[PDB]
């Protein structure tokens, strides 16, 4: 159950820019930050976790200054490095608390859809993907001691705390379960068969076609899609000539008892 803080910054021209963020806790979006609004918006009641109104207010401030700060830094590097608008900067950082051992953390950032640099240890570092003129930007970002310090305190000393506060305050929901409805269908022609499953949670699931107690590969699993309920949907399929066969579904809602269908 990792906490993923995602940031999306798009610079149209040197004139116009919007920057929105969100916080995923495992597979559940918890927070969302809008460019327009000043305050971060909690999506779940257990969002603020164990933190106080105070502890939270501090943190919110930090982001407020950051968002602006960050935005200008880019627009400046643009001038400094001769980059060309439009630009698309993304950022994905956070941590995952282990009950047994210490928690790990990560701070990645990508430019124009490509890993560019990350924060590891006590500084910044360029990805193997980023060109040799990025060393510049890195040299600059690293000159800044105070930020680096703060960044660390967040990964090793803040995120983790806020995560254990969530795990607790969210314990009950993360443990919820939802049995999915299942059914079969004909579908488009190669005659391919379809096995649909919809309305479940958590995300992990197991769906496969099989003609006997011993299943078979060649079952093409679709992609796991969402519903406004945070529930998921899934289509597993197979191509054949050979009529009789069945579909099975293994999940944690249908505890102990999987689901089977025929034809």
């Amino acid at each position, epitope marked *: 159950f990792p906490l993923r803080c995602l940031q999306i910054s798009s610079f149209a021209n040197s004139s116009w820019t919007r920057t929105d963020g969100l916080a995923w806790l495992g597979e559940l979006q918890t927070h969302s930050w809008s460019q327009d609004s000043d305050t971060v918006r909690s999506l779940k009641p257990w969002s603020q976790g164990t933190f106080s109104d105070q502890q939270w207010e501090t943190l919110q401030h930090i982001f407020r200054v950051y968002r602006s700060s960050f935005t200008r830094d880019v627009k400046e590097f643009a001038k*400094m490095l001769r980059l060309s608008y439009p630009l698309e900067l993304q950022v994905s950082a956070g941590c995952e608390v282990h009950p047994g051992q210490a928690s790990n953390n990560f701070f990645h950032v990508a430019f124009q859809g490509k890993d560019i640099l990350s924060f590891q240890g006590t500084s910044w570092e360029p990805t193997q993907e980023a060109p040799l003129w990025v060393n510049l930007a890195i040299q*600059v970002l690293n*000159q*800044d001691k*105070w*930020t680096r310090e703060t960044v660390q305190w967040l990964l090793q000393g803040t995120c983790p705390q806020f995560v254990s506060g969530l795990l607790e305050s969210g314990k009950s929901e993360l443990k919820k379960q939802v049995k999915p409805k299942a059914w079969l269908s004909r579908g488009p022609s190669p005659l391919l068969l379809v096995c649909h499953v919809s309305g479940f949670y958590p995300k992990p699931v197991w769906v496969k076609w099989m003609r006997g107690e011993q299943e078979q590969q060649g079952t093409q699993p679709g992609d796991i899609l969402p519903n406004a309920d945070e529930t998921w949907y899934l289509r597993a399929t197979l191509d054949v000539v050979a009529a009789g066969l069945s579909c099975r579904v293994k999940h944690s809602s249908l505890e102990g008892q999987d689901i089977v269908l025929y034809w």
Partner: T-cell receptor
Amino acid sequence: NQVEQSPQSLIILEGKNCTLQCNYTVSPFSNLRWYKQDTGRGPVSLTIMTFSENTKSNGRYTATLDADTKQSSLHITASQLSDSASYICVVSDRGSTLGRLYFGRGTQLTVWP
Amino acid sequence: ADIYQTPRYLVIGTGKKITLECSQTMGHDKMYWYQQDPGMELHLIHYSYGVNSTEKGLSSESTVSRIRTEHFPLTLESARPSHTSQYLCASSEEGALKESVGTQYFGPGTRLLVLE
């Protein structure tokens, strides 16, 4: 304005002391500078202060920095006529070349003999 | 100190092309151009991170060309009374490596007077 200075102006006899004030709301904070600009001349840099330092002494000038309250003051010991000038408070938001500068309207100091 | 400006005084008619020369003997990469109205504070009009770097700071009709480290000439295509003011040139030791962003160094300044 993000940087306010006080007092606006003051007059003092030579040999006496004085203390110029500076209060900023700039954020984030990187460092604080004090410039002395004589009549019809270039602003000259007296002292630079990072938040890790609360004191930077140059000649009869000593500048103190309190990052908490976000204010700085500049003490002048044994004032002499050459001290008559505009004293500017300058604040930087970044600890890098990536930093914008904010200048105060300045304090006008005149030293009478 | 090691930074230069010329001329210190200039009075010129409207529409005439002006350029304010600025040169540093120090190897400073970052340079600034300020405009200081009498009694007012320092206004940032142009700045440069290094050769070929020219960025606008207030939007003025002025232009800044940096084809070389030691030179940072400021030019006005067409003069106008509104341009009347003192123009200061500065360079910082900012950048590279130190336990602090290099302090600023200013020039003697140039007071231009534009008339009809």
